[PDB]
Amino acid sequence: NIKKEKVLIPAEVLIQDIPLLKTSFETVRKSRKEIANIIHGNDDRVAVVVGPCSIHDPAAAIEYATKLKEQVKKFHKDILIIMRVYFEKPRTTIGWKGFINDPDLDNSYNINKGLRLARNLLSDLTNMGLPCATEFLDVITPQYFAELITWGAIGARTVESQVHRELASGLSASIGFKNATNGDVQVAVDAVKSATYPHHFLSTTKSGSTAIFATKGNQNGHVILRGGASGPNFSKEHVDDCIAKLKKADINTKVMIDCSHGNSQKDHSKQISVLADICEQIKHSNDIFGVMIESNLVAGNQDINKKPLTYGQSVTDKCVDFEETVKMLEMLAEAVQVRRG
Amino acid sequence: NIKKEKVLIPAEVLIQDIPLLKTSFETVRKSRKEIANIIHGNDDRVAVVVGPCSIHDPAAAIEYATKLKEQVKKFHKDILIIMRVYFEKPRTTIGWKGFINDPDLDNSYNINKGLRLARNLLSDLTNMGLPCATEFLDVITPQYFAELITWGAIGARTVESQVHRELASGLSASIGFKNATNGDVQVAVDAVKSATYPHHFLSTTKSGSTAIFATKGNQNGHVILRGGASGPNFSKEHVDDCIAKLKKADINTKVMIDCSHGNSQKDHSKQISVLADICEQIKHSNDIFGVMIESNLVAGNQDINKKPLTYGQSVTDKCVDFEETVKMLEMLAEAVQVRRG
Ligand SMILES: [Ca+2]
Ligand SMILES: [Ca+2]
Ligand SMILES: [Mn+2]
Ligand SMILES: [Mn+2]
C-alpha cells in the first residue's frame, strides 16, 4: 500500500541553510528559563500562548508577530507572551493537515518546502525576540526546529501515546499535555508523570537517520485543560481536581487553561468570557499559571478553498482579532496585579 | 534532555541476516487474502487472533506455536487461526515496555537485539505455516518485520493518533483499530475511515533513513471492540451500534471482538464467558467476523522480577492455558457450523 517513497532533506541541511542566530539563541535560552519558573510557581506572572490556530501564511505571521512584540513591553512585568506557531490541524478523518504537510495549500504535499519555511519562520520570530510555541507531532519533524521552541504541546489526540510521552521526555522545551478529547484529565496527568522519567526509544537524528535515544526526562511538563465531550473544564472545580490529581502523582507543576477549542466550544467570541472566569481565579490562587488564546489579524475563519483568501484570517479554527487580544492581555495583567501581595 | 544517541541497525541488515523464506512468503500471501475476505464478509469462517499477551520468551513462543499449528487442521474449515505475536505492553506511566525495548528483561534496553529476535521469531513462526499478528507501534519498527505480518492492530491508546492512521494506510496487512480506552467506538470508526485514504506522511526506509511516504490507503481496516471505562462492549447491542456507525462512514468491513482486556475486565477466567455470548451472536448474524483471545502454556500471570520465572506463563496480562484455548476453538467452530446454511 505504498505508492512512492519520496526524498526528505535531513534537518542537518536546513540547519546549515537556516542557522540558529544569536538573538534567537538568547531569546530561547532566556524565555525557557522564564516559562519553567512560571510552570513551577517560582514566578507569579502568567504565561500566555497566543496566536493563530495554525500558520498558513508566513508573511501574515510576521505582521502578526510585529504587533504582538509591540505589546510585550506593556505587559512583561505581569505576563510572559509566547507566540503560537502551529503547523498542523487535527482532522476527524481527512482534510488539509497543515503548513508542513502542504504549504502551498493545493495537495502538492511539498513537505520539504513546508519544513524549510516552518524553520525559517521560527528563525525570524525568535530573531525578533519573540518566544515561540508549537505542537510536537512525531519523531521526525522536531529535529528541524526544536531548538527554536520555548514551549511545546502534546495534543489531546496523542496524550495517551507512548512515543509522545517518550519524545517529550527528551525535548528541552517545557511541554504541556492536553487532556483527552473526551475530557479525561487523568491521562494528561499520567502523561506528565511518564515524561519526567528517562526513556529509551526510537527516534531520528539531524542527519536523517534512525537511532535509539536515551532521554533524561522532562521536569517542566504540565497539564493543559481544553474541554472535551465531558464539557468545558476551565472552572475552579476542575482546576482543584486537576491539582489534586497532580499531587497524587507527586507532580508540583501548575495548570494551563486553553480558552479556545473545547472550552470556548469552538466559538471564538466565548474565549474572552472563559478568560474572565480564569482571571477571577488567578486573583485568588496561584494554581493557574497560563492560558492559550487563538488570535489573528482578522476575526473568525474561512474555507481553505476560497479564491482569493482573506489576508490575515484563519483558514482553520475561528480566532479573535488583535484588538480583542489586547483587551484579553489587559484583563490578564490586571488579574496578576491583584494576585500580588 | 538527551543523555545519548545510540546506534540502531537498519532493517536492511536484519532482512539480509534473516531473509523472507519461501514458506513464510506463501503463508503471508495466502493468509492475508484469507483474512481480507473474512473482514469483508466474503468468507463466513471466523478469524481468531490467539496467543500470549506479550512475548518475553521466544523459545516458549515456538513451543506454543507448535501446539497451535497442531489444532489448525482440526478447525480450518470453520476458523482462521492467526497467532498473536506482540512485542509491547501498554503502561499507565512506567514499566517494562516489552521484548523489543528490553529483550533481556533487565533494563539493558538492547533494542537492536530485540528487533533481531522479534524478526527471527516471526520468520520461524510463518515458516512453520502459522500466520502472525502484532501491534504496529510507530514509524520505525514496522520496517523490520511488516512483510511477515498477516494482520496488525492499532492499539486503544493510539486510535486517535494521526500518524497511526497514516501508517495503517500504507501497510499491506489487514489492520484492526481498537476502540478508545474510555470505550468510544466512533473514534475507531473514524480511524478505519481515515486509513482507507491515500496519505503523504513522514516515515522511515529499510536503509534507516527518513523519507516522505505516499500511501494508497488500506481497504482492509476494521474495528476491534475491547471494552473500556464505558464498560464491556461485546454484546449484540454494542455490535449493532458499531455496524450502524460503520455504515454511516460507508465502511462495509465487519467487527472483531477482543475477549480479553476491557471486555473480560482483565480476568482471564471471564474470556470464555465473553466468548459464549459472541458465539451465540455468530450463530444468527454475520456481523462479527473475528475474536481475540489471550492464551499461553500456563494459565494466569507473574511478576517480571520473579527469579526464577515460571516457564510458559505470562509476564504481563493474565492468559488462559492451551487446554482452555482448545475448548474456545471448539465453541467457535460450532458457532460457525450453526451459522451456515
Ligand atoms: Ca515529593
Ligand atoms: Ca457505498
Ligand atoms: Mn485550533
Ligand atoms: Mn494484553
Residue numbers in the entry:
A (entry chain A), B (entry chain A): 14 to 354
Please give the exact wording used by the authors of the publication that reports this structure.
We constructed and expressed full-length or slightly shortened recombinant proteins for the remaining targets to optimize protein crystallization without removing any functionally important regions. All structures were prepared as full atomistic models for use in target evaluation and ligand docking. Given computational and experimental limitations on the number of targets and compounds we could screen, we selected a diverse set of 10 candidate targets across a range of metabolic pathways. Our selected targets, as shown in Table 2, included the three enzymes we were able to crystallize (aroG, nadC, and lpcA), four protein homology model structures [shikimate kinase (aroK), pantetheine-phosphate adenylyltransferase (coaD), chorismate synthase (aroC), and 6,7-dimethyl-8-ribityllumazine synthase (ribH)], and three existing PDB crystal structures [enoyl-(acyl carrier protein) reductase (fabI), NAD synthetase (nadE), and 2-amino-4-hydroxy-6-hydroxymethyldihydropteridine pyrophosphokinase (folK)]. The success of generating crystal structures against some of these targets was greatly helped by the availability of genomic DNA, express primer service, and robotics to clone, express, and purify the proteins and to screen crystallization conditions. We mitigated these risks by considering multiple (ten) targets. This proved important because only inhibitors for roughly half the metabolic targets (four) affected bacterial growth in vivo.
